[PDB]
């Protein structure tokens, strides 16, 4: 089997992208946010919180004929944004572009954070990591990828996040098509329960790589590259009138500027994260201050490669008996 789907930036500036998933007989469909830093997939419901609820498209259980309660089960998740939500559990049948789970743990939320109400766009998490992290309890579920592992063709997936634009999510199989040159891969540690690597070092712009090892995650659900403080401050001393803000929490730097790029190494390769990716728009409306696309992870206690660096390259979440990860410049 494989499944092809189309992700979708919610906002202009890539805030976060979002996928089309059919739940339930007949099929109703989500947008939901795949994210490769979580194991959890739960939707906005029609046991959600009434006031909580703002424009978002819910699953009704009792409204599909292959949904079943799974009796006693519930679940609670934070994110590291200070997001969470909580609720209980059925299972159903749900799709993928194409691709089928029949009796998937569907966490249907009785409760969501402020910014999840928020976010109109966004009906839900489709949790990527291993499945050691997934928070149902007091029997933990599998993710949608775990369960449709052995029925694939090949046991990946790929993540080919646009820039300002609509990308992919592929299950099962490689699209030769979709990059430039190899693909390059790199060791996984899964022992966090993360797609967790290390990169071989960095380069500012035109300057000279920097080799040094960067232990991080892959994580599609986090919008930013959050790197260590030296790295960070290297990169934004390039950009003349950039300065780290407490009050903003976070680099700033005047919109006027032209952003150097920022390359990261996967083993002996190279991916070059474009500058204008790493502009985020003004820190409020009408102001000429930005926010940057490169932060510190200072505080955060691990370095995440978001949405700013994965939408520069075509990532291989390579789920073999031994994972690891691919990058290729596209």
């Known amino acids: 089997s494989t499944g092809s789907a189309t992700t979708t930036p919610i906002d202009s500036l890539d805030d976060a992208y979002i996928t089309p998933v059919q739940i339930g007989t007949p099929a109703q469909t989500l947008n939901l946010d795949f994210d490769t830093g979580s194991s959890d997939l739960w939707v906005f419901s029609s046991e959600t919180t009434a006031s909580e609820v703002d424009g978002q498209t819910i699953y009704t259980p009792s409204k599909s004929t292959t949904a079943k309660l799974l009796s006693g089960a519930t679940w609670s998740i934070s994110y590291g944004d200070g997001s969470s939500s909580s609720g209980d559990v059925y299972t159903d049948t749900v799709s993928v572009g194409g691709l089928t789970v029949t009796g998937q743990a569907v966490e249907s939320a009785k409760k969501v954070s402020s910014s999840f109400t928020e976010d109109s766009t966004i009906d839900g998490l489709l949790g990527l990591a291993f499945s050691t992290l997934n928070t149902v309890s007091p029997t933990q579920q599998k993710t949608f990828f775990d369960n449709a592992k052995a029925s694939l063709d090949s046991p990946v997936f790929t993540a080919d996040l646009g820039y300002h634009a609509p990308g992919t999510y592929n299950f099962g199989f490689i699209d030769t098509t979709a990059y430039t040159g190899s693909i390059t891969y790199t060791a996984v540690s899964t022992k966090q329960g993360f797609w967790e690597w290390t990169s071989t070092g960095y380069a500012v712009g035109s300057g000279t790589f920097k080799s040094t090892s960067i232990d991080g995650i892959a994580d599609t659900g986090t919008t930013l590259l959050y790197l260590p403080a030296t790295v960070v401050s290297a990169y934004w001393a390039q950009v003349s009138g950039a300065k780290s803000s407490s009050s903003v929490?976070?680099?700033?730097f005047p919109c006027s500027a032209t952003l150097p790029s920022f390359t990261f190494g996967?083993?002996?390769?190279?991916?070059?994260?474009?500058?204008?990716?790493?502009?985020?728009?003004?820190?409020?409306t009408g102001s000429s201050s930005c926010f940057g696309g490169i932060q510190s992870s200072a505080g955060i206690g691990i370095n995440i490669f978001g949405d700013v660096a994965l939408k520069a390259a075509f990532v291989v979440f390579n789920g073999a008996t031994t994972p690891t990860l691919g990058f290729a410049s596209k």
Not at 249 to 252: D, E, L, Q, R, S
């Open 249 to 252: 929490g976070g680099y700033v």
């Open 266 to 284: 996967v083993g002996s390769a190279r991916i070059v994260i474009p500058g204008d990716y790493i502009d985020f728009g003004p820190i409020s």
